[model samples]
Target chain A: GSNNELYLELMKLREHSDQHVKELKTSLKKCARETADLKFLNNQYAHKLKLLEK
Target chain B: GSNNELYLELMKLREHSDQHVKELKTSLKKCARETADLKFLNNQYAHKLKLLE
Candidate 1:
């Protein structure tokens, strides 16, 4: 039964690690989106200024 | 000796997971900086437009 406990612990630890990685990946994706949004908005504003140069 | 191998495997797995998390965290931080840089630049250009108006 002692080895059984070790096996259970191993499974739980792996599960926790997997969940942690998934959550962080989600966050990283969200962060990428934020960067893109800002980049797009900035370019649009720059274009607006260029139009005014006429 | 079988138990010894399990312990070694456990340590290696934990180390790898730790390293992965650290790398991801570094990437996340760099992403945040990118967002901030664009935000700041955008505001400055908007300000420039307002001055022209």
Candidate 2:
């Protein structure tokens, strides 16, 4: 029986999946950070653009 | 104009969630298998100790 091999395969799949989920988590974190920064910059730029109209 | 694109993006998000869930399930299954092995080994060793006593 290749039970050992099958078990190892399952272990590898689990490991790979953990890594994939981790990458997704990291990406989501980065996106949140970027969006926060964009909002900050947008406030400043919108203020300047309003000044241009005066 | 991009609502379809947005919907696709949401679909992708759900797919990622599903993938993550699948991984969690696999991890749980592996843990179960390992736990079973440990339980079996523990029983064997326990039996040996009783025999020795």
Candidate 3:
């Protein structure tokens, strides 16, 4: 039928894309948090090295 | 090797991501609700201006 044309499918595809983007944003936030934690630990271990030498 | 990590690596990044997805959904719901308050306030001011004329 005419309604089954490509444009209709495109609309559904766009919705799927948007949903995935939303998920991506959430994952980005989490990864950003983990990266920050790693950075903090790196600094902490560096400090410990200084203390051990003292 | 620093095994004394504060945060354990999440095995299921997908599941962890899914949990936050629900959180985002909840936050979006709250934002939508707050938007209604904004809409109500805007409409009230709009109606007040209409009455002042």
lDDT of 3 by residue, B1-53 (tens): 33323122222333465566667666655655555555565555545545544
How many residue pairs clash in all the candidates, one count each? 0, 0, 0
- Across B1-51, the per-residue lDDT of candidate 1 in tens digits comes to 988788668767766776777788888889988888888898899899899
The per-model DockQ list reads 0.52, 0.02, 0.01
Q: Residue A52, candidate 2: how far off, in angstroms?
A: 90
C-alpha displacement of A23 in model 2, angstroms? 20
Name the runs in model 3 displaced over 4 angstroms. Answer: A1-4, B1-53
TM-score of 3: 0.45
| Better DockQ candidate (1, 3) | 1
Flag the better candidate by DockQ, 1 or 2. Answer: 1
**Model 2: per-residue Cα lDDT over B1-53, one tens digit each:** 57556555555655566688676556655655555555555556555455544
Model 1 chain A — which ten-residue stretch has the worst lDDT? A3-12
Which wins on lDDT, candidate 1 or candidate 2?
A: 1
Residue-wise C-alpha lDDT for candidate 2, range A1-54, written one tens digit per residue: 574565555556656666777876665555555555555655565555556557
Off by over 4 Å in 1: A1-16
Ranking by DockQ: 1, 2, 3
